[PDB]
Design an enzyme around this catalytic site. Sequence first.
Site, PDB file in Angstrom:
ATOM      1  N   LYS A   1       0.841  -1.199   0.000  1.00  0.00           N
ATOM      2  CA  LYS A   1       0.000   0.000   0.000  1.00  0.00           C
ATOM      3  C   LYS A   1       0.873   1.246   0.000  1.00  0.00           C
ATOM      4  O   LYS A   1       0.641   2.167   0.784  1.00  0.00           O
ATOM      5  CB  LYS A   1      -0.891   0.030   1.260  1.00  0.00           C
ATOM      6  CG  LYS A   1      -1.864  -1.138   1.419  1.00  0.00           C
ATOM      7  CD  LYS A   1      -2.956  -1.069   0.380  1.00  0.00           C
ATOM      8  CE  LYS A   1      -4.076  -2.061   0.658  1.00  0.00           C
ATOM      9  NZ  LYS A   1      -3.544  -3.453   0.836  1.00  0.00           N
TER      10      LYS A   1
ATOM     11  N   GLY B   1     -17.701 -10.030   1.476  1.00  0.00           N
ATOM     12  CA  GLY B   1     -18.983 -10.112   0.797  1.00  0.00           C
ATOM     13  C   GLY B   1     -18.949 -10.201  -0.718  1.00  0.00           C
ATOM     14  O   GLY B   1     -19.987 -10.412  -1.356  1.00  0.00           O
TER      15      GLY B   1
HETATM   16  O1  BMP Z   1      -9.337  -2.500  -1.105  1.00  0.00           O
HETATM   17  C1  BMP Z   1      -8.649  -3.404  -0.639  1.00  0.00           C
HETATM   18  C2  BMP Z   1      -7.280  -3.512  -0.950  1.00  0.00           C
HETATM   19  C3  BMP Z   1      -6.580  -4.552  -0.396  1.00  0.00           C
HETATM   20  O2  BMP Z   1      -5.293  -4.706  -0.710  1.00  0.00           O
HETATM   21  N1  BMP Z   1      -7.187  -5.439   0.457  1.00  0.00           N
HETATM   22  C4  BMP Z   1      -6.381  -6.545   1.001  1.00  0.00           C
HETATM   23  O3  BMP Z   1      -6.855  -7.778   0.422  1.00  0.00           O
HETATM   24  C5  BMP Z   1      -6.928  -8.808   1.429  1.00  0.00           C
HETATM   25  C6  BMP Z   1      -8.396  -9.168   1.691  1.00  0.00           C
HETATM   26  O4  BMP Z   1      -8.319 -10.340   2.500  1.00  0.00           O
HETATM   27  P1  BMP Z   1      -9.715 -11.032   2.909  1.00  0.00           P
HETATM   28  O5  BMP Z   1     -10.129 -12.022   1.732  1.00  0.00           O
HETATM   29  O6  BMP Z   1      -9.322 -11.793   4.254  1.00  0.00           O
HETATM   30  O7  BMP Z   1     -10.766 -10.028   3.186  1.00  0.00           O
HETATM   31  C7  BMP Z   1      -6.220  -8.240   2.671  1.00  0.00           C
HETATM   32  O8  BMP Z   1      -4.822  -8.542   2.551  1.00  0.00           O
HETATM   33  C8  BMP Z   1      -6.463  -6.722   2.536  1.00  0.00           C
HETATM   34  O9  BMP Z   1      -5.408  -6.008   3.185  1.00  0.00           O
HETATM   35  C9  BMP Z   1      -8.513  -5.327   0.721  1.00  0.00           C
HETATM   36  O10 BMP Z   1      -9.079  -6.128   1.446  1.00  0.00           O
HETATM   37  N2  BMP Z   1      -9.215  -4.308   0.184  1.00  0.00           N
END
Ligand code: BMP
Lengths: 218, 219
Positions: free
Chosen positions: A64, A178
């Site tokens: 990020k 979701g």
């Molecule tokens: O908009 C974004 C950008 C991301 O990098 N992420 C990253 O993607 C992953 C989502 O993981 P999860 O499937 O457990 O929700 C995490 O590593 C989070 O930091 C996100 O969820 N939303």
Amino acid sequence: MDVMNRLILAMDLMNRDDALRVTGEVREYIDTVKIGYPLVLSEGMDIIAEFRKRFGCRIIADFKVADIPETNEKICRATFKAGADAIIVHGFPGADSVRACLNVAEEMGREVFLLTEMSHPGAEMFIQGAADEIARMGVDLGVKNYDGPSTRPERLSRLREIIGQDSFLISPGVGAQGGDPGETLRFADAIIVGRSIYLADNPAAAAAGIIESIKDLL
Amino acid sequence: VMDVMNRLILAMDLMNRDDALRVTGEVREYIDTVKIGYPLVLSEGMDIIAEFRKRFGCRIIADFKVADIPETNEKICRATFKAGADAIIVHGFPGADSVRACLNVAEEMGREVFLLTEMSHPGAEMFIQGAADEIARMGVDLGVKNYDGPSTRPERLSRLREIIGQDSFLISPGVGAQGGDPGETLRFADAIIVGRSIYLADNPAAAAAGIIESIKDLL
Ligand SMILES: O=c1cc(O)n([C@@H]2O[C@H](COP(=O)(O)O)[C@@H](O)[C@H]2O)c(=O)[nH]1
Ligand SMILES: O=c1cc(O)n([C@@H]2O[C@H](COP(=O)(O)O)[C@@H](O)[C@H]2O)c(=O)[nH]1
């Protein structure tokens, strides 16, 4: 970028043993792993090389990146030295900050992914209103790889519209947050999945199940 | 609020343990608060925080510009505080839930959050500047007490101080290399952050001493 099963594992476990075990359990299903700060700050940047040694997967460093140009350059250099194939960069801090990352990536033979809109509720406050302009900025800068939200398919579709079919698009928020795997792959080249796999009773069955649900999408 | 010696925070962005330790040691008599960011941490590991505490006993601000979803923000803060950081710097642009996640961990763990509301570089004008007043007001509404804003735009820094009030704590980078003036910045900020002017100097101690001499009447 050829992502096996259009599925990228978000490995956000914070213990080396668990992270290695779970990744090993699902290795037959993926060849691309997203490693972020939860794992890196817990176990060190050497974990990237460990993953390449054990799994021979491609590694996306989800850092990020969101600093001034001078600092972004240093972060990218440290990250690619550690063996990451690509890095995720915020667009909100502006064009100079993104260009700093693109420069290092070009120098070291890696890719930058531009994060244009995020998946969580807070993204609506400031990021969403800037997101289309950030995507256009990416196009202007020659960015070819983008990152946008599974949780808002209409916004993900708009991102795809702006960048075109030739650009590469990955999308998190599938499962836990979701987002739907199949719907997301209408627009994204690959889905990112973290908790739905790595917190599952049986991570292997979880990955297998997701892939089953999208099997006709490849 | 934290008592920053000489109102001066070192931005230690060298990427080699030996050099980072040498420079920090050289300016220790002038500075008791060190900002450690990803250039150093990604190069040397989170154990660099431990080493600085062992060697210098300086306060450590982890400049990690935390900018993820709430769940990931929580993990980053936990790992950072576990390593011994006194405080962490968090972006406001991802919105209130992301900031709250960091505040909740900081509260549980007895540490502090600094909210970065606006940035010092030219690109900050594209998207961040337009959101900054609202991000700052959001911080105040969330109960944020510590803030981080740019020295390179005095009018903006002044406005940030207005929004957060005199009781809030404000630190400001962009002094020296980026063109910000120490004295002018301290009209509004509690402490200035200085990196390259000090750590790239032939004599970092003399560079720090010179900065402090220039703001002596403000201490
Ligand atoms: O908009 C974004 C950008 C991301 O990098 N992420 C990253 O993607 C992953 C989502 O993981 P999860 O499937 O457990 O929700 C995490 O590593 C989070 O930091 C996100 O969820 N939303
Ligand atoms: O708006 C901002 C916010 C920052 O954290 N910084 C950080 O403050 C420091 C500035 O260092 P320098 O004095 O070398 O310009 C760097 O660590 C940079 O990442 C900044 O320059 N501008």
